[model samples]
Target: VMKANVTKKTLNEGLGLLERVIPSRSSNPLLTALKVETSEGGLTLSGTNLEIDLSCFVPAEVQQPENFVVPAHLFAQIVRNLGGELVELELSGQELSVRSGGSDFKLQTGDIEAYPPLSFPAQADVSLDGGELSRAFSSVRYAASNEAFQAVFRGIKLEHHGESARVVASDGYRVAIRDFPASGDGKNLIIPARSVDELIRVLKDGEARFTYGDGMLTVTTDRVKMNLKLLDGDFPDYERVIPKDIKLQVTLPATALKEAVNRVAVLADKNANNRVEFLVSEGTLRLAAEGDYGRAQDTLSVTQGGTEQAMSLAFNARHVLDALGPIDGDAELLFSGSTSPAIFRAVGGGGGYMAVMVTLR
Candidate 1:
């Protein structure tokens, strides 16, 4: 028997956290159920899809200590539709009853003992604020590859050294790095892309704690405890890829270049390489694209700063746009040669950088 009283808002938020990990369909029906255990301590809600697990706690007044499982979707829906400040949950045999205000819902229960145990390690290695984490994660996740061929390149690397840290990601074709200030001992963490995305979704306004143990990263927020299994591999040597010298450099307004690329890429061949050519000469930067479908050309005024000579290179139009998206103010485009990778960064940079491989023509 289970009986507990919890605030509607707390219950709703807890259910929301649990819903993220519940599989839509599972071979074991118990995996689709959310286990709610109530005691004098509080109410704990947990759900898992075998790969990821989320457990949340909510304040409640417990009349009896009990544990039971209910269909996650149905339970969440019933709680969401309940119109009341307080929600009461009572379990009778195989049926779970939800009561709030004037509405009452009865949902079939599942085998609580069948749910797999989700145990999280309790040692913490670093603590950081959500705003800082979100900023760092946003910087690198975009550069991660969706392909599963090179598993190491499919995640973001979080490298920390005392008060400074850097987040980096690369998809072989392009790489991005963002540096920010942090307070923690030195540590290197390679978190899977899916885990990073889910972590971003559950971040709150205040400080977030991180615990790394047993090859998993556990993030503790005020309301939720999220465990993300880390990728077991070292990230690529990104520093070696960063170019130290360039033969040509040009500075152009970011908005102008972004607009020009978008306008010119419309005619690029979808079947062929979505290639856009950039030709820099004098004070003008030429952008051109030709496909079986159509052709487009546009020019923008730019200020050349290094090696005053005509140089041209081709790159994927999508790659160029992604390289430009994170930058602000004027963008500095650097080239080593026609066949070398092109680098894009903010003028008077402070840690945000992108490198794109140029197409050989």
Candidate 2:
């Protein structure tokens, strides 16, 4: 062990970063270890699972001391389970020491040089308020693509225009679009759905300053700093896919309709073209799903506007539910045609939040 000094906040931030990318078990034990080093600015903790890497900077415990590394699992566990508002780290020989919230722990250290090198550009990054970022995640993260293998499919496209920022997400089936009045001059960027999810958890209650440049985005708060590697590709042209000039419209109580769909979805099989049908009439919604398990049906009373019309349209349950989960109170579904795409909008949530999807047979 090499003697070093660091603060509890520093250790916590560093460990948090490692927790993001550090694999629980690595065939190569070195990969599970955290690389700890002190350099120009502060303490940096890094962890990697070969494919993805995470590193965070924290305040220094001491001015300057020897640089070294510790076993990431053991060190992070010690820090986490130790349970304290703050923590202090010290390393002497093979033994590691930690103190926090009136508790103490001693652990072992690991070789630092064996860890993978973390390379991030030092250029300034585009910035935004942390709450605005959180709101974007809350409004549309449900639409992130979860299909295996494709990375771009799992992130939301961040479109920046003057004082506004738009978060657009889709799973190749349904799309969630929302915007925030973010004040930034930076160019548009795409943040992975996973990173946005992680940020919502970490920055639970605080304002964060964001800076984006090159291919990296750095989000900072008084308590934490997060650096995310933007998804490196152009997002699909979703606007062109959205159907326009809709003529048919239906107004419904959001919860009642969602609950009805959720109940019926259990029986909807995706392979049978995985369909859920909706029958709309004056002041009522009839939803049904049929599969190998047979069929399920539901009807809910809702307010209707426009001309009284009756139409049966089949849709993917998953896609429809994505739109419903974000909407409460009143929802308006604008149907252009039986086979054409439909637009779902919620009143009072700002114009950025909209759902667009194609109607199935």
Candidate 3:
């Protein structure tokens, strides 16, 4: 009873957009597929796994209407394999007909009864550049945890001020914060780190409108609408961990430090906590890591201040690498003491990222 005609490219595009958020493998049968709805407005494709919901709309020539569900992965697989510029869909009884140039396939509507009830909120709270939103999520997402045991630290918190929005993520061992300008009012919430990664992938350029209410948040972008359940928990007050007494600050290029750490990390002790020694000898800084296989050492000229005394420090190579990856241009490393927390930030300030890593024995 539902009929429509659309370009195969557009249908494939919509399906591809929804695929990022759908569960790839799951025990529940309902979690594997997507629903395609037909109407005069257009053809809509939606997918969800209860935690996150995604919807995409495709412009199509519609003659009639009926909405049905299909195994999204199978539908995408079939559509991708078919050769044609046009795709037709017709619904009859419990089966949906899909056809292109030389291929015709009939897919069951799938059980609508088993599907979870999902909806996108219709209110707009704030609209921001999609590019910035994507970057903001990417800048600090790596610090969030992937496990549920530390679920509270598994979310990235967003706090909106009059001029800018702050994003922060902490997985107990490390913490990262990034600030980006936005046109949002006073609002505060946290989003699951798993869901944040999907947004980072799906969200594109143009404008993204955010809708928040009850316990759900919907982000409507140029090509899709993403709805996710709000995470419930208070992030720890991480500012207290910032070292107040900075006795030393090392200034150097972030890219150079990243390269030095990665090269030296290859010889880092795999079982000994990636121990990398930092030594300030004369005016040069050295990075050294050793394991049973071999040892590696790299040096970078650094401009040091705050103390005339040379210092020796040790930290996890992986932590320093993670902190430097998101940084842009020059980096400044601040040290309160050889045993206290070490902070990484941009030189001349306003680089929009800050991270704290603890010293390792």
Q: Best-fitting candidate, measured by TM-score?
A: 3
Question: Per-residue lDDT for 1-361 in model 1, tens only?
Answer: 6788889998898898788778767888788899887888679898887767888999998876888889898888889989888998888889888998789889988888777777765566678777778767876677898695788899898988787778888876578887777776747988888888878777876777788877888888786888888888888887777676788889999999999999999999984567899999988899999988779999999998676488888888887887788787899898887877778888866454554555645
Give per-residue CA lDDT, model 3, range 1-361, as digits (tens): 6788899999889988777667778898878889877788679899887788898999998777877778888888888888888998888899888998788999887887677666787677887778887888898888888784667788999888878888998877678988888887857888988888878977887888899877768999876888887787787787887777888888888888898988998998776888899887666789999999999999999889886457789988888888887877888888888888888889855658888888985
What is the C-alpha lDDT profile of model 2 across 165-277, one tens digit per residue?
A: 88888866567888887666777677877777777766544456666656767666654556676888888887887877766688778887788888998899867655889
Give the CA lDDT, 0 to 100, for residue 249 in model 2. Answer: 80
| Cα misplacement distance, residue 117 of candidate 2 (Å) | 4.7
**Residue 68 Cα positional deviation in candidate 2, in Å, after optimal superposition:** 2.7
Q: Lowest summed lDDT over 10 consecutive residues: which window, candidate 3?
A: 113-122
Report the Cα lDDT for candidate 3.
Answer: 0.83
Error of 2 at 324 (Å): 1.7
TM-score of 3: 0.92
Alpha-carbon lDDT, every model: 0.82, 0.72, 0.83
Cα-based TM-score, every candidate: 0.89, 0.82, 0.92
By TM-score, how accurate is candidate 1? 0.89
